[PDB]
Symmetry: C5
Subunit: 257 residues, 5 copies
């Protein structure tokens, strides 16, 4: 039972932070990148290296202690940080043609963010059920061929940063009543990134009943993926490249029964 919003100067708070991308970080110089992408010969032999696998980002943000009142998330401003880095087409890249600049970051992207009053709820789905996910990651267990389309056994919480690979988990549309999530997968090997920035855009997080995510235990959960595409090295080897995401959330106190 959601009751009235509290008013007064004391009745609002805001959270501001950024989430770093978790692309794999294959050495001490390659934060924000994955390891070079290799191709297994068969579905059966697919055994991706941990450093080759982008993972979901998550932060649990403690809010001011309330107690029954709960913090309600009302608005979000969000932004991908560092979009102009993609203008570095002069570093270790592959010339597009003789004497040309380096091919820029392009290809498959996944841009995703969520705000909730509890951990994002995940459903596991795998491209290839015979993929062996590596030690150090949290992945769909006991996968069967049905896991390639929908296996309801694969339920998890996004409760650990740099652990849940992007490719084998999505938000669970059968749950997540207390989260708002948004994402876009743009495929193709050459697809161009299109990255917009502005400080004038706000997303309202209220549902159809005028209620936003309610923060259980006075914690706010923010999640993100910003795989921007792949960087191609001079040899032609490709690595995922990601960027950080800014969040600013405005919250208000709501009485509940």
């Amino acid at each position: 039972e959601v009751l009235e919003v509290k008013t007064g100067v004391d009745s609002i708070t805001e959270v501001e932070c950024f989430l770093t991308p978790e692309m794999g970080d294959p050495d001490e110089h390659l934060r924000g990148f994955s390891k070079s992408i290799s191709i297994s010969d068969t579905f059966e032999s697919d055994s991706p290296n941990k450093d080759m696998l982008p993972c979901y980002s998550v932060a649990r943000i403690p809010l001011p202690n309330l107690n029954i009142l709960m913090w309600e998330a009302v608005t979000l401003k969000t932004e991908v940080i560092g979009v102009t880095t993609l203008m570095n087409v002069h570093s270790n890249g592959q010339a597009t043609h003789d004497n040309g600049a380096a091919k820029p970051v392009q290809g498959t992207s996944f841009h995703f963010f969520s705000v909730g009053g509890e951990a994002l709820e995940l459903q596991g789905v795998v491209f290839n059920y015979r993929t062996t996910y590596p030690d150090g990651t949290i992945f769909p267990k006991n996968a069967t061929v049905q896991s390639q389309v929908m296996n309801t056994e694969h339920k998890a919480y996004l409760d650990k940063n740099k652990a849940y690979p992007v490719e084998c988990w999505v938000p669970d549309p059968t749950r997540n009543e207390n989260t708002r999530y948004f994402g876009t997968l743009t495929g193709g090997e050459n697809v161009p990134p299109v990255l917009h920035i502005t400080n004038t855009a706000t997303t309202v997080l209220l549902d159809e009943f005028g209620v936003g995510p309610l923060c259980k235990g006075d914690n706010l959960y923010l999640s993100a993926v910003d795989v921007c595409g792949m960087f191609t090295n001079r040899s032609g080897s490709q690595q995922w490249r990601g960027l950080s995401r800014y969040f600013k959330v405005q919250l208000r106190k709501r009485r509940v029964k």
Copy 2:
């Protein structure tokens, strides 16, 4: 004669489910994929195997037993499940260029969904009237050259899963008064998938008179196609890849005369 909506706590219900894709499933490891695509050498000799043909998906969901009242479908939330699986560019694929990642799923897609109070009504249309559709599928019978543009003999109901090939049937626009349907064919051999996910988007199913689909015999019909594109293996052979679709439908009791 549609009369008033019933109110009270007892007067609403919801259906939540998913429909798996039916892409052909050529072996025990390839759920969600078709058989590799082969090309006939003439129009006359076109004779696709069943496991090479994506089919429409359908589920008929029983609703709480009534009785006249009928359940009226009012809103829909829907989502393609497992969009991030398309980031697996590391297995059984063909490098985009020397030393690159595997070419991702791309090319022709068809994303389609419908919600109705009875089976989706279909009209048959064929690319090539001399195509021999295989045993175990339901296809336009007695096809003539006119069937390549419009032959009104080809009427059917989507009343069996894993049976009506996508390529030879479409929703019948002369019927379907009691269904709401939505589809997009995106062609081209290289077209990139663009897949959005969110739990914040609702489609209203009411017609211009404020009336949604009315569920005959207390059954709700959900139909879907989500052919995402084709997967290319190292040799260049291509197979369709599909994903499951989530549905959540809100219904209310309506009195009719």
Copy 3:
């Protein structure tokens, strides 16, 4: 004519539902919905396309319930391209995209066009190349000059015959068509992907800025269409236009006029 009040009551509304088949050229008994393979002339001077290679506009004249002054006024339209999923047949006599791949799908230049009017669609002729010889059996801009490549006001016609007016040399005349509503999109490029949407939830309102729809002269409704979806490439590389049928549902009401 002064437009006066709309008539009401059960008897005052009617609806037309039909489909228009595409007229792509139909080069043999097996190839309804396709054109003949496209050949390229050596020079502008020698351009002489065969009739079976030229998509034409589709038109249907639909008789309405007899009136009488009352006229039927067309108010709304639902329309849809029929058979969009046929483009998923990439296993039939096509050219593989690469070694061992599926066939190249239908793609490239498309023209999707529809109109609803109370009289024939009015056409203006414009030619890519004024030296093109349009074939016997078509209706085309006559006495074409070099100015016909940009605008020659002599080239006026009515879309009054099916499978006769080639798409490439006629467009709706923007100086006329007061009693028609028309809509079209040319999407060019040899590789451009079709994007075809279907739904039974979309309605176009046909009323002008004064609240008046097309008024059906002689109790006839005119429907016109083109749905050239792109080109099909066969094994040899030869290309043919492929078209699809278009569904129309029009709601009409009786309107009194002076």
Copy 4:
């Protein structure tokens, strides 16, 4: 100019309907609507395009019913359309096959679709890709160009006051002027970009500013301007020519009293 009330009554409205032909260069007696085939200089300093290779702005000055209280015709709405979009379906004439046995490559690549309605000539600012480009006799071009002309040289001010004379590539609408004109344009670059051309008789553009006032026609003349470079046509040899189309305009005007 104080803008006062609109006149009403049957006498107080008029309309202009016309078309503007494209001015692509017209290199011979058979090639109206096309430019000469494009050739490329070997250095910036030797860029010297021939007039027939250069698309120019189109303009028409349309006399209105004579009015002279001071009354002026006020342009209120516009309907506009590119004429002949389906000509781009001729892929069977003197073209270059896309692949063995294929149809001809259609018109594609860089396009500029532009139109304006004003109560006086469109005001232009000159900007050049390369300041050492020598524009040819019979065109009007930025004079005394310097290297700063490649980004902004305020000396280069002109009026679009002559048809088939102002090359498209070295002039744009001057955003520091044009108070009495409404203009709209889109440059879509790339050598392979597909034309996307929409036609309909159901679309109207309102020409009123934020104060409810449309272009006011000085001396009872209405100025219409356009460019509709649709892309390039590729001949069998590979040589490329710009192809343009005409533009239809219908403008509704009303009488407005001014002080």
Copy 5:
């Protein structure tokens, strides 16, 4: 405390100007272009010359002295100047194919503008932390591998024209309360420019409380980047090409406490 707006003839003013692009200007004939782009052999050896690096544009515009009253920026009209120069495909470019016209300007673009009552606040982010930025530029200092995703040390003000390289700075979303900024990075090596011009479009600069940027010390700050793409010359070498941006801003006097 923002109080009432002043009214009357004297209470408004406007700024109209243009900002030239700062692409590098490698010689006396190449204003608006960068130096040809060269590619470093390794990430470690990336050492771009200043004339190869586009920089942010900025103008500080003095307003009529007020003193408490401040000028408040309310509306913006803006336009890229010279869009039709991209139609010069006859000036030492590289033919698209034998006998063809020159390839036009295409590939990565960044179009950005801002209006504020103080300098644009910047956050440094680098593609490659081992890039050595050149003398004469202002760049992220003490860069570490963390600078590739987010290093909060890299804070700056856009306070000097032709000095802050585009590729290593973005607007800081954690600041800029008194600025409105808007930008789009469109990547890919072949992406077509799409440039719209009109004198009929206005952007409102008021925030959700009805308050525009407030001009501290009676100065208005305008900033821009309009990298349109790369020009490829006959040799295959590629250079950035930029264009100027027009600004017209309307301001009103606002009382504050």
